[PDB]
Amino acid sequence: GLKNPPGPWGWPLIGHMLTLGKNPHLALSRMSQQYGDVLQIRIGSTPVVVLSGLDTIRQALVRQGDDFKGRPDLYTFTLISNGQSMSFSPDSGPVWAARRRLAQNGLKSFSIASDPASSTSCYLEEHVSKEAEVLISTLQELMAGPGHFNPYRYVVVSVTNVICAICFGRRYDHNHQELLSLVNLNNNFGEVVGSGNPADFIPILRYLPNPSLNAFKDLNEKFYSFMQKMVKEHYKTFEKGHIRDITDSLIEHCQEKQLSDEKIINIVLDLFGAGFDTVTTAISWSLMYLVMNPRVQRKIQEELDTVIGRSRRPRLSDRSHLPYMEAFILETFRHSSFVPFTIPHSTTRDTSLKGFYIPKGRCVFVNQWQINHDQKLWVNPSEFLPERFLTPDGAIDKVLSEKVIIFGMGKRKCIGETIARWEVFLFLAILLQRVEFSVPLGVKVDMTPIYGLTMKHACCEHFQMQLRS
Numbered sequence: 001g002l003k004n005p006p007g008p009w010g011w012p013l014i015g016h017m018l019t020l021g022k023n024p025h026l027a028l029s030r031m032s033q034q035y036g037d038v039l040q041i042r043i044g045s046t047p048v049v050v051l052s053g054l055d056t057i058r059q060a061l062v063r064q065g066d067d068f069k070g071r072p073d074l075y076t077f078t079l080i081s082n083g084q085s086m087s088f089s090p091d092s093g094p095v096w097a098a099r100r101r102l103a104q105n106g107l108k109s110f111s112i113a114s115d116p117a118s119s120t121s122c123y124l125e126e127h128v129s130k131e132a133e134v135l136i137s138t139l140q141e142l143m144a145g146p147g148h149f150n151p152y153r154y155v156v157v158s159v160t161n162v163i164c165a166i167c168f169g170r171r172y173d174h175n176h177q178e179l180l181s182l183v184n185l186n187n188n189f190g191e192v193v194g195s196g197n198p199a200d201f202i203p204i205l206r207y208l209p210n211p212s213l214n215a216f217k218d219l220n221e222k223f224y225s226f227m228q229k230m231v232k233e234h235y236k237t238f239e240k241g242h243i244r245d246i247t248d249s250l251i252e253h254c255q256e257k258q259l260s261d262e263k264i265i266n267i268v269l270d271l272f273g274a275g276f277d278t279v280t281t282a283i284s285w286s287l288m289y290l291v292m293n294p295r296v297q298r299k300i301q302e303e304l305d306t307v308i309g310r311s312r313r314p315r316l317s318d319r320s321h322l323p324y325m326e327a328f329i330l331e332t333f334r335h336s337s338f339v340p341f342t343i344p345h346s347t348t349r350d351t352s353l354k355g356f357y358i359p360k361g362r363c364v365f366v367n368q369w370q371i372n373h374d375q376k377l378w379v380n381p382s383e384f385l386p387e388r389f390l391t392p393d394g395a396i397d398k399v400l401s402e403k404v405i406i407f408g409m410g411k412r413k414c415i416g417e418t419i420a421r422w423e424v425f426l427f428l429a430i431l432l433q434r435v436e437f438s439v440p441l442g443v444k445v446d447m448t449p450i451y452g453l454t455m456k457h458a459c460c461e462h463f464q465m466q467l468r469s
């Protein structure tokens with residue numbers, strides 16, 4: 001038959017806003033244990049259905065994909081890309097799918113396709129090798145200097161120049177101030193649009209003195225200013241036959257052609273933003289796990305010494321033949337789950353899920369964190385143990401690696417998964433082959449994640465690095 005989704009009691013005006021608290025991913029996981037994989041809360045007066053369970057989510061996002069492919073009409077999204085963001089706009093219909101096809105093509109055309117200037121590698125491998133070595137020599141300068149560094153500061157530039165080369169054909173010095181301007185100055189994007197923001201559900205918090213949202217509104221049109229001054233710089237030097245960027249890839253499509261040319265050109269912003277921010281957090285988390293688990297660091301290097309040695313620079317060729325790193329990366333994604341919730345979803349129409357009615361327009365949270373820490377899928381899920389993914393013969397258990405959910409599911413799946421998987425692998429491979437990372441004893445290193453759409457960690461200034469052998 002049909003039932004309504006269960007759920008706990010909530011306050012008549014604010015709902016469950018206080019039981020979510022500072023860490024919705026944790027509050028809604030405990031709630032799932034009691035009420036199950038399909039439950040119901042209210043943030044203010046706005047109902048929300050929360051989805052947990054590996055297969056319950058797969059059933060909704062994949063098997064009933066177009067019932068669950070929408071995006072809710074939340075305020076914070078209206079301030080992203082002038083209210084016309086592909087990834088955050090309410091547009092779910094054909095206008096959206098088209099822009100998604102243009103971003104998928106522009107991505108693979110200037111990332112995995114072979115570089116004309118190299119018979120060896122693809123675009124992505126060239127860029128990541130360049131920044132990987134610049135980053136190493138940069139980091140050495142700092143041990144010669146202060147003797148210690150915060151890695152996030154310099155990884156964010158090296159990561160950004162990769163996605164900045166795929167998109168704008170330009171890179172920036174590690175101290176270019178108009179860049180830290182963008183990517184390393186009051187970047188609270190993730191913390192504001194993380195699922196459950198009070199300002200999206202409490203209409204008066206948008207008008208009261210809100211520093212966190214004033215910083216947010218200035219960040220987004222400071223990024224929209226950057227985009228317009230790089231596409232105008234590109235149309236001044238654009239040549240029909242020779243496409244250099246993803247930007248020129250879209251300028252081309254504007255010429256060939258409800259699909260505004262604004263809606264085509266501001267796609268590169270969604271790529272540039274998700275590119276630099278997410279991959280950076282992954283690498284930064286990986287290095288926070290290497291410092292705090294030296295055993296895992298050496299066994300990564302031990303594998304690199306036996307499968308490639310120190311005679312040659314690693315390549316994407318070697319990704320398939322390095323199982324223990326694929327395990328470390330998978331466990332960095334799983335233990336941290338630095339993307340605890342997908343971007344909120346919305347129902348396109350009345351539908352049902354595991355026997356529960358959900359009407360059209362209902363806001364939906366997808367608790368990826370709950371999957372990666374479900375104690376019935378993982379033995380000891382709070383422990384960082386990459387070995388959990390390795391078979392008795394030292395290979396990757398592919399069925400258990402496909403239970404790690406961090407790139408979403410269904411028709412709204414991340415379109416930069418393989419880029420992020422290759423970029424994260426290559427960066428870590430080139431660095432760990434030639435250097436080791438360390439934090440002296442007696443220093444504080446808070447591993448506690450900070451909630452957000454992409455959870456970050458507390459800044460750590462005490463990283464050290466020395467070369468090997």
Ligand code: HEM
Binds near residue numbers: 087407409411417419
């Ligand atoms: C570890 C790195 C990354 C993670 C964990 C990640 C995660 C996600 C998640 C959870 C979603 C939304 C899922 C949903 O809405 O159901 C998403 C969407 C998206 N991702 Fe990623 N992402 C990563 C890297 C990247 C990169 C490198 C790019 C571009 C080069 C990218 C581009 C996008 C875009 C454009 C969307 C919007 C898709 C849509 O809403 O239709 N992401 N990502």
Ligand SMILES: COc1ccc2[nH]c(C(=O)N3C[C@@H](CCl)c4c3ccc3[nH]ccc43)cc2c1
Binds near residue numbers: 277
């Ligand atoms: C869950 O991981 C995801 C999944 C989907 C995503 N989308 C985006 C994204 O579209 N943008 C747009 C862009 C402003 Cl247009 C921007 C971001 C993100 C951080 C940013 N910092 C400065 C600008 C900026 C990030 C992201 C992360």
